[PDB]
């Protein structure tokens, strides 16, 4: 009957709802982990940690990739903007010259505002767009004095052999030298151990 069906349905729903993730207070949260992931949640978390460490060790760091992406994006964007700016200036210049209205000449002058160009950042080098500064690392001398770990050894060995090493020999020597140290030695300016090496190589024996 209608009343009997309603009562039975209500009672069954009340009974079933109680035995549905409503255990609640138990003094521990391991039940939640076992419900969401299963019995072997620890192994899955360990696998995730191992995968993350492997991805980081492989060189797939987000920052070092996004930096290059944004640098190239800014490089293309600057040119794509400065060409449309030139076209818009030329149109107004032709309208003002071949026409007779001063308004277009004033528009061209406004387009020629130094503040607008500085705000657009076209004069600035593309590196300043991403946040760093343009460095001329090749201007500094490349000799034994303050050479770095690999370069000083390579130059010493070349002086001993009285002949410059080729590209393949240099690459193999550098690879073996990095491998024997585990690759933990600094190789880029952002590495924290560059200053220590620079200080260590700052004294010339008498």
């Amino acid at each position: 009957f209608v009343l009997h069906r309603v009562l039975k349905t209500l009672d069954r729903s009340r009974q079933l709802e109680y035995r549905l993730a409503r255990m609640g207070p138990e003094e521990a949260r391991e039940a939640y982990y076992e419900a969401v992931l299963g019995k072997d949640w620890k192994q899955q978390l360990q696998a995730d940690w191992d995968k993350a460490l492997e991805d980081v060790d492989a060189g797939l760091v987000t920052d070092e990739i996004n930096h290059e992406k944004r640098l190239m994006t800014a490089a293309q964007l600057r040119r794509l903007e400065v060409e449309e700016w030139d076209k818009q200036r030329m149109k107004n210049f032709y309208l003002a010259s071949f026409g007779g209205l001063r308004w277009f000449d004033q528009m061209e002058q406004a387009l020629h505002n130094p503040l607008f160009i500085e705000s657009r950042g076209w004069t600035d080098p593309v590196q300043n767009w991403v946040g760093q500064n343009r460095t001329y690392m090749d201007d500094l001398p490349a000799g034994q004095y303050m050479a770095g770990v690999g370069n000083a050894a390579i130059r010493i060995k070349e002086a001993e052999l009285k002949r410059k090493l080729t590209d393949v020999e240099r690459a193999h020597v550098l690879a073996r030298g990095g491998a024997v140290a585990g690759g933990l030695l600094p190789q880029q300016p952002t590495d924290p151990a560059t200053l220590a090496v620079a200080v260590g190589g700052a004294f010339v024996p008498s």
Binding site: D55, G59, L60, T62, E68, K69, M72, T73, Q76, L80
Partner: protein, 119 residues
Amino acid sequence: SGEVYIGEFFAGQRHGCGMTLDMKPYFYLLERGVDPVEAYRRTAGAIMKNVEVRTWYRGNKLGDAKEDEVVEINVLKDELDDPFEIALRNSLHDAKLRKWKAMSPQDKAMDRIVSIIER
């Protein structure tokens, strides 16, 4: 006025962390013939209690438009999506890095051009 501000400035306006004091009662008592020691004894506690520490953005005080909770709210919003979209987005994030790691510079330039055109 008695306002004292100590901290960071950008351009010509307050921008960064700063500390604000209102030493108006001390100056008020000092200007009325009270020796500095007595005025300090009278008005040290009130001035010390009203010391303010703030973060300023372009001359404006933050902390009244829920600037502090923006990151957590956005994290919860990202977690409120449907599972399939979250999984696909997380897979795409790794796929993009793995693809970019091995591309040629010309391919990278073409990819960035395509991305700019799409944007």
